[PDB]
Each structure stands twice: as C-alpha cells, then as structure tokens.
Design a protein around this ligand. Structure first.
Ligand code: CA
Ligand code: CA
Lengths: 315, 316
C-alpha cells in the first residue's frame, strides 16, 4: 500500500525531476500535496509548472489531483538570480502546454492559488489519517514553520522528513567572498529554520547531504538515453530538464520511492546560524541527548539511474 | 515556381536552429543545399552536432534531402558571452534530438561531414551551383568575408543575395559591455573587419535584418505556448523547447528567405567601425561617394512570420 507524501520544493529543474519520481511511482507513493518556495525559483513559475506537470500526469496516467500551495517563506540569504529563472522557461515548454492539460490546470488554478504553502503543509500532515512523509528539496523554512507553530501536534503525524541539504564530511557549495565554502545552499538560504528542523526531538530525518549527492553527477550520455523514450511524455520532460549539476533532489525523492537507494548513518546535526564564514554549515554537535539525523551514505547510483529512466516511462 | 538554392551560415544558438527549421521545412520554396557552423554564439563542435541531429531527425521523418554540414575555422575578434554559447551543448542532449534511429543516421554520415572546412564549403556550394545561391547568415560575417577575400567576384557573381541578421542602424545596439557604448550589435561585433568587407563589397546584393526591424517582433510566452498545441510534431517539440529556454532575430531572417513578403527594404550605404573604440562593431550610414547599397529590412509582417513558423513546425 502506497504511503502519503508531500513534496516541499523550490521549483528548479531538479525539484521537478523529483516531482516526476514521486508522482510516477503510484504503487509506492500517494502524492497528497506539494508546496513551492520562492528560493531557487520564482514561486509563481514554480507553482504553475507544478500544476502543469500534475495535470499532464492526471490526464495520462490517472495520477490523482492534489493541492498545491505557494509558500510565504522569505529568504535569510537569497539564491543567485542566475538560477531562479529555469521554472519560468519550463512554464513555456511545449510538453507542459498541451491544451487538454492546460485546460484542466486553468480550471483548478484559482482554488490552488488560495492555499498558502506553510499552512497547507501543516494541514495535510495533521489532517491525514495515516502518517505523512515530507520530501524536502528546497530550504527547510516550511517544515520549521510547522514545528514552531504546531510542535508535537505536527511532528507526531510525520512519518519522516527526507531532506536534500547540507554537507557533513565534505565541502559545501556556497562559494561567496564572505563564506568558506563549507555550507550547502538549501541550508544557507535559511539557517535558523534548518537548525530548528535538525534539532527537533521526535522527528525522524533522512538527510541527503552533498556527501551522497556528489556521487551521482548528471552526465550527457545518460541524459541522452531519454531520447530512447520520446513516445513518453515524462521522458521528453525529464530529458529536457536535465539536458539544461548533480541529481541532488532526484536522489532524495528516489529514496522516498525506495529506501534501497541508500543506507544511512546516525549523526547529531546542528546548523551554524551566526554570521560566520561557515554560516549555514551542518555540523556534528557534541550536545548531550541531541537528536540523531540519518545521513545518506554510498547511494546506489545504477539503481537510481534505472529508476529514473523507468519512472519516466509512466506516460 | 521552383525552389531556390540556399546555404545557412550560422553560429549555433537557439534562434539559428529555429532559422534552420524554417529553411529545411519549406522544401517547395527552399532547396537547402548546405550549412556551416561558426564558433561564435556556440561551441562549434556542439553547433555542428546539433545541426546534424536536426537534419537527420527531419530526413527520417519527411521528404528532405540530406546536405553537407561544415565546421567553420573562423576565429573571433570579440567572443560572445560564455553563458550564451553553451546552449548548443544543452540542445545536443535534448531528448527529441537523440532518438536512436536519428542518431544512428547522423553517426553514419558523420565521417563525411566532419572533414569539411566550413569556409571552403560555403565557397564551393555557392560557386559550383548551376543556379545562383542565397546565403542566409545568422551568425557573424566571417565566412562570407573569407569567400570574398579569396574569390572576389568569382564568388559574389554566384550569390543571389546574402540575407543577414546583424547590425543596428538608427536604433541602439545590444552589445552592453563596460568598454562599449551600446551602439553595436553582437553578430557584427564578433568580427567587425569581416562585416566591413561584406557591407562594402561592390557587386553583392545584401538584405539586412538589423535590430531596427527585429526589435518589432519579440518572442512572447503565449505564442511560444502555442507549440504545445502541436506536440504530435517533432519540430514543434523542438522549436517550442528552444524558444521557451528576446526577439526572433535569426528566425525572421530565415523567414524572409522562405518568402520575401516577410518585409520590405530600404537602400542604405552601410559601413562598419573596426577600430578598438567604444563603438567598435557599429554599423553606420556612410556618405562616401559610390559606396554600395545594402537593403535594410523594415516593418516585418509579424503575424505572417508567426504563422509561417507555427505551420513550418508541423512539417514533421
Ligand atoms: Ca531544489
Ligand atoms: Ca545566431
């Protein structure tokens, strides 16, 4: 029996590949909602692309429709302008603008525009009958808001949080004049929210930090293999997105589909929030009784790559 | 009517490929006899590959004869922004251009094409054609200049006309760098000396699509989204994907080659600034006695062009 999942993303190409993985694997995942954050994307574009992908899938593989909410979360440290656009251009991609699918999105657009992402995440998790897995592929601002505002009443309903973020025993990817390169972008965007999430007791966390995502880079030959599947809408979609980096978010969602993707190691993780060169770094803390986070280790690359090619044949 | 011979001289960016689709899809009007790719607004290797992948996709899905494709040895005077040149690399990996049967065909004819020298190929195609040849230039003018320098009148006498995307005459240019004044356009700026040779060549008919005309036909989301109405056509998936990720510069230029109804033209004597000054690469009017005229496009038929492109993208 599939398990409930909510995708908490920030609308970049990798977030959409993660969405396709979650959505296409209906035997393992029941996608009950998604929210988009104005981090590594312009939220209005991320919102529309999420909607267009969902409708395309609903009309071609019977994927049940779900609510989509734009989060009000604001950045502590903004992503570079040169990223963010991507979702914008994807909104104009032909495969996401087939009339039957756009017509459906335009019909349900208005009601989805009434949702605010943070509240939607809280509600989906707290009103679900069974527990909910949250796949976070953007900053941790929304899960943090839910923890801060609902506490145990929210966390008790979470199966686990599978998070793309951080860098534990490897360097990060935030290279600015004022940083030391040890922090990763999703955490650096909002360190305090990340700290709240990683230090929260009673919350199970699976963390795909750069330690693991670095081992599965996006290479041209593999991407070109989607050309073997152009009769499938999702292969045209995924291939196009990766043809435009590592499989950061996709690996995270792959684990939600099947934990065989990677084994984990328990690590107590704190986040640096002071304005230091390593602001945003996820570090091992020595604090007594500090909650553990299960950090992904040695991901199964071949298994993941095959999973994505297969998932892209759902329709 | 009979189709006319055309050679596409391009530099591998997104609009160069839309231009390619327009030319290749209109077989009743255009006989595309060859193409060359320059290392300007693309890394030539990638531009060459994408040109081949598109040609093979079309040949395996419609009546369109294969043609030679060559890599130009032209070198930049002023290179394009690194960020813009990588698009051919991205296109090289797009799924619609990597269907096995099409990649297989490209792999089979690759050896013959990778041995051509682009500049000599342009000269040979033009000069050895029975009828005159129209050159559609959507990248810098380095290759036409090379041909004029090497063969002079033996080359120009065989050119029906050169339809060029480039320049800015009475409007601002688009080269905005700390060292420039903004009056130059990129294709000319990439190699000003070659452009000067071309625009000052006596005995060469030139049609110029400068920013003065291209600025009037911007690429807009609603229109680009219309390619979503035609996803059963490979070229619509292709064109829509490229315009989705600005004006139809190169595409307008190629559309005119398909049908001159796209625009009327004004005779203007065009010279080019070659000196290393803030306006390097600017295309300027010259009052020099006996200077040759260039026919500068005006008031392009936007709707006609937009419809032509949508229809052409249904060729396959
Ligand atoms: Ca992301
Ligand atoms: Ca060009």
């Amino acid at each position: 029996s599939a398990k409930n999942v909510v995708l908490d993303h920030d609308g970049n190409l990798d977030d959409f590949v993660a969405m396709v993985l979650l959505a296409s694997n209906t035997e393992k995942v029941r996608l009950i909602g998604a929210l988009c954050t104005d981090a590594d994307c312009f939220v209005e574009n991320g919102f529309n692309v999420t909607g267009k992908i969902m409708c395309l899938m609903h009309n071609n593989m019977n994927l049940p429709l779900f609510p989509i909410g734009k989060s009000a979360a604001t950045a502590v440290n903004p992503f570079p302008k040169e990223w963010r656009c991507l979702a914008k251009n994807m909104d104009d991609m032909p495969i996401l603008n087939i009339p039957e699918n756009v017509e459906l999105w335009d019909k349900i657009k208005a009601e989805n525009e009434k949702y605010e992402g943070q509240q939607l995440l809280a509600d989906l998790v707290m009103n679900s009958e069974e527990k909910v897995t949250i796949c976070v592929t953007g900053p941790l601002s929304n899960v943090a808001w839910c923890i801060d505002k609902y506490g145990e009443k929210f966390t008790s309903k979470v199966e686990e949080c599978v998070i793309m973020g951080g860098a534990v025993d490897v360097r990060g990817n935030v290279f600015l004049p004022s940083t030391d390169g040890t922090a990763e972008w999703n955490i650096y965007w909002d360190p305090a929210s990340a700290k709240t999430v990683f230090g929260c007791p009673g919350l199970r966390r699976i963390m795909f930090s750069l330690d693991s995502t670095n081992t599965v880079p996006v290479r041209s030959p593999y991407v070109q293999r989607f050309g073997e599947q152009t009769n499938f809408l999702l292969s045209i979609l995924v291939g196009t997105m990766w043809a435009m980096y590592y499989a950061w978010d996709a690996l995270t969602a792959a684990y939600v589909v099947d934990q065989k993707v990677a084994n984990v190691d328990p690590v107590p993780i704190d986040v640096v929030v002071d304005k230091q060169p390593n602001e945003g770094a996820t570090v091992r803390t020595d604090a007594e009784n500090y909650p553990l986070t299960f950090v992904a280790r040695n991901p199964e690359a071949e298994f993941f790559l095959d999973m994505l090619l297969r998932s892209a044949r759902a329709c």
